[PDB]
Symmetry: C3
Subunit: 59 residues, 3 copies
Amino acid sequence: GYIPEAPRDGQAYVRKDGEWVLLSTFLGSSGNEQELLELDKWASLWNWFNITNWLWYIK
Amino acid sequence: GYIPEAPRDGQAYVRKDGEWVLLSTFLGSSGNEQELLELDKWASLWNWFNITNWLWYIK
Amino acid sequence: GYIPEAPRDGQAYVRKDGEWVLLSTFLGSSGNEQELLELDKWASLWNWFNITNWLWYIK
């Protein structure tokens, strides 16, 4: 059929069940961004533990 | 001016080549969900391999 | 009270501000896909450093 009409608030919406649903809901954000941004956190520690990396190297 | 929407069965589709295309196809689905869910699997072994971590700690 | 129509060139767009916006922008692949595909690279070395894993195992 036809159903052209979506909200305009700068946000993004997808076509689902003849309804506008925030695409972000299909992305899986707010429930998996952890694994996406975790490496950024763990990397910090690993990146700092380099002190033992070089020391042992030039020990 | 306007284009026909897709069916209504709980699924979602995007605007591509004037046709309905499951967004999931754009997310890759299985084509990259592996690296997204791999750490969850490998973490398990690493997490259970802590037995040797504390061992050295408490000797 | 309707949607433009979106272009037809093989690309895809979502419903945003009453305009066609490449969903890919919401997937995340512009100055961050690195952290997404980095593990694939670093894994190579980690996967290769197994030489020391088995060596120490079988001495």
